[PDB]
Amino acid sequence: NGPSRDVKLTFAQIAPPPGSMVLRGINPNGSIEFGMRSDEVVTKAMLNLEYTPSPSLLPVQSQLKVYLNDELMGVLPVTKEQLGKKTLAQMPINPLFITDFNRVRLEFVGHYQDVCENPASTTLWLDVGRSSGLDLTYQTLNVKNDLSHFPVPFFDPRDNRTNTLPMVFAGAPDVGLQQASAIVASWFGSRSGWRGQNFPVLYNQLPDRNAIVFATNDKRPDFLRDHPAVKAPVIEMINHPQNPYVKLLVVFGRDDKDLLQAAKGIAQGNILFRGESVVVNEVKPLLPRKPYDAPNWVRTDRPVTFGELKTYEEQLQSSGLEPAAINVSLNLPPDLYGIDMDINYRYTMPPVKDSSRMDISLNNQFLQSFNLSLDGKTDVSIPALKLGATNQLRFDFEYMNPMPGGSVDNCITFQPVQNHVVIGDDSTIDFSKYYHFIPMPDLRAFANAGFPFSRMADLSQTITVMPKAPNEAQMETLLNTVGFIGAQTGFPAINLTVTDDGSTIQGKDADIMIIGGIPDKLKDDKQIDLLVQATESWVKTPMRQTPFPGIVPDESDRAAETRSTLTSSGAMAAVIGFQSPYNDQRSVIALLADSPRGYEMLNDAVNDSGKRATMFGSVAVIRESGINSLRVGDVYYVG
């Protein structure tokens, strides 16, 4: 029937890093997780395991149980011919139990000795190699062209891949149509938060996959020549003419003033979709946005609770023979510039007085410890440990269990009772004792949060200087830029102001984002440290670039030492930040690219969250090698 695809999920990318799970006696549970699109269905599932049993295991009393959503699929005993040898097992997974979200948990029942056995012994282990994994074949369904569940054919929250969503136009879209696209692109990036975005743009084509079609009565694409011209901006869902499984979202209006109204109904609030086609009429303007009010950012205006920082409910509690580390990810403004926590926790009482303790770590670095000596409460002061756009607060509850005691003639073993620890809610963390001050130009803040343009979530104080006639590469790097910017804040850029020429930005109190080339009125301002012409290029390398700079900027190290000008026929992109000459507090970020291949490297380095995190300083050269970034130029402060 439909088109099916075979995927090979390996334990390297779907299991906790590094991928190899060492099943032990204290933590006998390993688990991988995968989700199924509601427009797909699995037909064959097979779990290829590669485990190495401990040479000390009792053979047929030690097993490796494999569950799927707490439903035992099969058990693999440890036959005596496997002890210490890399065993290659393969268990079939029944697709009838594969729901929209699935958990494959491996339990390891391990025994090394009948009598006087220490269950927490380091001799009980079973190392599942990272080469293990699932091979799944998904089959595409034919969902009816309904909008009640609107984004799920185009962005499925179950699919954890990078949400590729091509946007096809009739031609080079004018400024009115660039605002509508960037608003929808910023919204689809708002939803597909941590998994990445990719908006390949097409002009008068069809992308063979679920896409968006921006069309108007005057300029409409090829296949929409026979569509009736609408009165009000309409949102309708059709299917690819040559593929009854590829759906298309057609944003159709009378002119770009309507597509901007439809794109605001999609992004701002909801249209309350019901049916195949829906006309958008109610604009319902939105109350202005206060700075640093992005939904994905921790509230600095007040002490914020831990119940507000946790995504799901089971995050602030763990249990087992060795309780897992409670994790609380808090995403902060890069403008932030100590912390006062009030943590009330509860835990099972350890055996004796001073054995166990609770270690707090922020960003994988020790902060403080507390003996567990039951409820607890503590006030903690965190130093400013280079707090970035995303931090990780971790609580451990490291217990000390007794080894088998007594004596040789009579050994009393302690059947290990499991410990429940819970970082109790009502626990607050306070950031109100922090000032908003940042030394710009900083690309580690643009890469990680899009800071100059994300301090106002809706990108209201932001101007985008597009090229005059945008090709399918300049329009792509725009939807990708406001794509990830929308993902860091978690709010669409409804109030974005796109322009087309350099004059319209003069004397404005807004941050500028230059997507194409660079306007000649901004081009020769000496705060620029790199320019990418057709083939000729020049860069100012700093005086002294240290691997780790420290909090203080040290303006003396950031001074431009030389100016080199090389001319190569290779490909290069760039992301440079400097100060706007029209305001001493506004910043400007330029996304340069010389050749058609240059944009391909630029858009890639923007989509990939891993490749983007390698950006810092004021200049980030993007070549085939990777990203080489520089801290050079005058460090103007903002805030």
Q: Name which of residues 566 to 585 contact its own copies (CB under 8 A).
A: 566-572
Query: Distance between CA 85 and CA 50 in Å, rounded?
Result: 10
Q: Which stretch binds its own copies (CB under 8 A): 175-183, 241-249, 534-542, 610-618?
A: 534-542
For residue 114, give the amino acid letter: D
Q: How far is the CB of 407 from its own copies (least distance, A)?
A: 6
Give 248 or 513: the residue with its C-beta nearer to its own copies. 248
Give 302 or 468: the residue with its C-beta nearer to its own copies. 302
Smallest CA-to-CA distance from 175 within 543, 491, 421, 478 is with 478
Contact 513, 481 (CB under 8 A): yes
Q: How far is the CB of 19 from its own copies (least distance, A)?
A: 8
Select the residue interacting with its own copies from 228, 507, 547, 610 (CB under 8 A): 547
Contact 35, 100 (CB under 8 A): yes
Give 419 or 481: the residue with its C-beta nearer to its own copies. 419
Q: Which stretch binds its own copies (CB under 8 A): 18-26, 39-47, 326-334, 463-471?
A: 18-26
Query: Distance between CA 456 and CA 486 in Å, rounded?
Result: 11
Give 314 or 375: the residue with its C-beta nearer to its own copies. 314
Give 20 or 481: the residue with its C-beta nearer to its own copies. 20
Give 43 or 546: the residue with its C-beta nearer to its own copies. 546
Select the residue interacting with its own copies from 24, 540, 586, 631 (CB under 8 A): 540
Contact 421, 399 (CB under 8 A): no
Q: Angle 332-335-340 (CA atoms, 0-180°, nearest 5)?
A: 55
Residues in region 380-409 near its own copies by CB under 8 A: 383, 385, 398, 400-409
Query: Distance between CA 50 and CA 126 in Å, rounded?
Result: 10
Binding-site size for its own copies (CB under 8 A) equals: 158
Select the residue interacting with its own copies from 88, 229, 411, 469 (CB under 8 A): 411
536 binds its own copies (CB under 8 A): yes
Query: Distance between CA 336 and CA 332 in Å, rounded?
Result: 7
Residues in region 60-99 near its own copies by CB under 8 A: 60-63, 65, 69-72, 74-75, 77, 84, 86
Three-state secondary structure call for residue 514: strand
SS3 labels along 413-460: CCCCCCEEEECCCCCEEECCCCCECEECCCHHHHHHCCHHHHCCCCCC
Select the residue interacting with its own copies from 140, 545, 583, 614 (CB under 8 A): 545
Give 28 or 166: the residue with its C-beta nearer to its own copies. 28
Residues in region 591-630 near its own copies by CB under 8 A: 621, 623-625, 628, 630
Beta strands at 29-35 and 573-579: parallel, antiparallel or unpaired: unpaired
Render 345-383 in DSSP notation, one character per residue: -EEPPPSSTTS-EEEEEESSSEEEEEE---B--EEEEE-
43 binds its own copies (CB under 8 A): no
Query: Distance between CA 287 and CA 458 in Å, rounded?
Result: 11
Q: How far is the CB of 301 from its own copies (least distance, A)?
A: 8
Give 67 or 245: the residue with its C-beta nearer to its own copies. 67
CA 391 to each of CA 410, 442, 556: distance values in angstroms, whole numbers, following the listed order: 50, 18, 30
Q: How far apart, in Å, do the first and last CA atoms of the chain sit?
A: 59
Residues in region 248-287 near its own copies by CB under 8 A: 265, 268-269, 271-287
Contact 163, 170 (CB under 8 A): no
Q: How far is the CB of 123 from its own copies (least distance, A)?
A: 4
Full strand arrangement of the beta sheet holding 419-422 = 317-320, 419-422, 346-347
Q: How far is the CB of 116 from its own copies (least distance, A)?
A: 5
Residues in region 483-522 near its own copies by CB under 8 A: none
Query: Distance between CA 13 and CA 10 in Å, rounded?
Result: 6
Q: How far is the CB of 595 from its own copies (least distance, A)?
A: 10
Q: How far is the CB of 59 from its own copies (least distance, A)?
A: 9
Query: Distance between CA 284 and CA 628 in Å, rounded?
Result: 45
Select the residue interacting with its own copies from 194, 257, 543, 581 (CB under 8 A): 543
Residues in region 314-373 near its own copies by CB under 8 A: 317, 319, 344, 346-349, 351-357, 359, 361, 365-369, 371
Q: How far is the CB of 49 from its own copies (least distance, A)?
A: 14
CA 135 to each of CA 9, 221, 399, 500: distance values in angstroms, whole numbers, following the listed order: 6, 39, 38, 48
Q: Which stretch binds its own copies (CB under 8 A): 134-142, 220-228, 436-444, 545-553?
A: 545-553
Query: Distance between CA 507 and CA 520 in Å, rounded?
Result: 16
Select the residue interacting with its own copies from 1, 242, 410, 503 (CB under 8 A): 410
18 binds its own copies (CB under 8 A): yes
Residues in region 162-221 near its own copies by CB under 8 A: none
Give 360 or 465: the residue with its C-beta nearer to its own copies. 360
Residues in region 293-312 near its own copies by CB under 8 A: 293, 295, 302, 305, 307-308, 310-311
Give 1 or 625: the residue with its C-beta nearer to its own copies. 625
Site string for its own copies, 437-466 (x = CB under 8 A): ------------------------------
DSSP label at residue 404: P
Cis amide bond preceding 18, omega within 30:
yes
Give 175 or 367: the residue with its C-beta nearer to its own copies. 367
Query: Distance between CA 409 and CA 365 in Å, rounded?
Result: 45
Unique residue bearing structure tokens 């006087």: 116
Q: How far is the CB of 338 from its own copies (least distance, A)?
A: 11
Residues in region 108-137 near its own copies by CB under 8 A: 109, 111-123, 127, 129-130
Q: Which stretch binds its own copies (CB under 8 A): 55-63, 448-456, 461-469, 473-481?
A: 55-63
Contact 128, 49 (CB under 8 A): yes
Select the residue interacting with its own copies from 167, 185, 260, 421 (CB under 8 A): 421
CA 218 from centroid of its chain's CA atoms: 38
Alpha carbons within 13 A on the beta-carbon side of 185: 30
Query: Distance between CA 488 and CA 482 in Å, rounded?
Result: 10
Give 206 or 575: the residue with its C-beta nearer to its own copies. 575
